[PDB]
Design a protein around this ligand. Structure first.
Ligand SMILES: [Ca+2]
Ligand SMILES: [Ca+2]
Ligand SMILES: [Ca+2]
Ligand SMILES: [Ca+2]
Ligand SMILES: [Ca+2]
Ligand SMILES: [Ca+2]
Ligand SMILES: [Fe+3]
Ligand SMILES: [Fe+3]
Ligand SMILES: [Fe+3]
Ligand SMILES: [Fe+3]
Ligand SMILES: [Fe+3]
Ligand SMILES: [Fe+3]
Ligand SMILES: [Fe+3]
Ligand SMILES: [Fe+3]
Lengths: 172, 172, 172, 172
């Protein structure tokens, strides 16, 4: 149907649409986390900044997947963006752990998208996933794990002083 | 009860949560339009840029309303962002017309929020709506109307030459 | 009658005079708190700086209300500035809590001034209150609530280590 | 017998020589199109410049492939660069269509080279093809499609004005 489409399986196009939805959902979760930390009864402003930045970055990765869909002659098909599963994120340690899990899920779905690209012999799609998503997911997961470890060693969440100082020193 | 809450009725808290979801919906619609215009068989780069900037601006307003919710002692409650009821926006003129109607609906809902706010003797929320949304939406609807009028006067949608030149001279 | 007076009822003139005295009272309380934190047996320099700046800001608002009184054709009538009902503010957390309540009271009195202003069909005074006081007091109360929340979460007032570090990392 | 040769299959060597020829040919086609638009009876200056830049870039791609052949220890075997199919390219839209077809063909043989390379477990050759050729081809095809779409929507080739305005706005 598209004059530019070449070597671009319809499974790959649907999988790209689903991945776009996933990146937008991650962006939504991060947004809710961020403004949770903006509440006057939490007031961890750098946690808020950190999560809001990650939310904009997930939105950027969704926009790049939409660009990629148009680049391949695919056609973008958007779904509802589900609300996050929680509205109260308990603590900075618990937010960081939910984000760790969220990035692990996103990575796993990216790895399935890669294996689909490879078994459909679409090396452009495989290398796009590699170059723009795979190492970024690994760096994100490593950094979240670092934060989780530090918060836990400092005595979070029972130690609110721990979360305050982490907000000041690591997220500052 | 919040330690900062003062003169913030529950109706306006809920209407703010609804307005947050509405502004997130608006940016979703603009994002869909933007990448429709990035398709290989549409290829109007400045229409795409225009709607992507509108998208980001709507997201910034949603975040501003979240900030106000937290500022007022309210609780942010996020619901699903409904997918745009359209996939193919047909043309630049039709996209501008749909944006005009979207913004008009957002505007009347903002006025209903303001009417509720002044009904409940909450002058900070009313002036906030005024200050940060009312004239912004008026200018936005006026701009979109100008865009619609120009594209129509130029021969859109029958002549793709009109849409091409509007994309270059106005959206450029 | 003034040569410039127009649509300035006597109730709002008197309420402006009362608000002038209230804002002078607020700055007096902040000044007392500031130098409490300068005592040799308290010695939290940035708490002191913070409350002295709040004091000067309240004095600037009192002077702004005086300027508005003169602008509207009214007569400034000054009454005694009542001494703060406390000498010893006990701790940084308790000082922040007292400031939170002070500002909350000032805010509801500002809303009563606005309600009177819109009762009397005086839209300039109402928008002036909005513009120059309503969102300022909202931001102030939110900031003080954040401060209270952090100091509490950090272990104040039991651990003077929390107050020391808050003084360094947040008020610094 | 190359002292540097390692994991470089004789089929990979030959396929690289064929790709070198194909890129020099793409360069020749672009050169012929560019000087067709420099004709006094066509005289579309920016079409000319665009296709000259495409020709210089295609020959840089050829030289990168020759350098790759040497890095891997294979041997450059060059062949005739065939003259293009057409001397007269008819119009700007027809030229853009021929360019789109030509680049889709270059892309198909690049994908075949990647399949060969991964069939021979030559991951260096694969990743080289990926990062220096495959996304550049995907972007080139997307861009030519966009151009064709605009020429068509504007009413080319029947409207000489459409191609004039496209020359001035998109290509200038
Ligand atoms: Ca790769
Ligand atoms: Ca429809
Ligand atoms: Ca006492
Ligand atoms: Ca020949
Ligand atoms: Ca690879
Ligand atoms: Ca280019
Ligand atoms: Fe991501
Ligand atoms: Fe991510
Ligand atoms: Fe808006
Ligand atoms: Fe808007
Ligand atoms: Fe004040
Ligand atoms: Fe104040
Ligand atoms: Fe090439
Ligand atoms: Fe090329």
């Amino acid at each position: 149907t598209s004059q530019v489409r070449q070597n671009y399986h319809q499974d790959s196009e649907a999988a790209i649409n689903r991945q776009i939805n996933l990146e937008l959902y991650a962006s939504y979760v991060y947004l809710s986390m961020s403004y949770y930390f903006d509440r006057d009864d939490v007031a961890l402003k750098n946690f808020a900044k950190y999560f809001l930045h990650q939310s904009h970055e997930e939105r950027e990765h969704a926009e790049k997947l939409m660009k990629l869909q148009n680049q391949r002659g695919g056609r973008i098909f958007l779904q509802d963006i589900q609300k996050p599963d929680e509205d109260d994120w308990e603590s900075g340690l618990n937010a960081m752990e939910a984000a760790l899990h969220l990035e692990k899920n996103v990575n796993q779905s990216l790895l399935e998208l890669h294996k689909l690209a490879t078994d459909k012999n679409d090396p452009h799609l495989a290398d796009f996933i590699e170059t723009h998503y795979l190492n970024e997911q690994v760096k994100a997961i490593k950094e979240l794990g670092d934060h989780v470890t530090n918060l836990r060693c400092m005595g979070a969440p029972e130690s609110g002083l721990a979360e305050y100082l982490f907000d000041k020193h690591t997220l500052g």
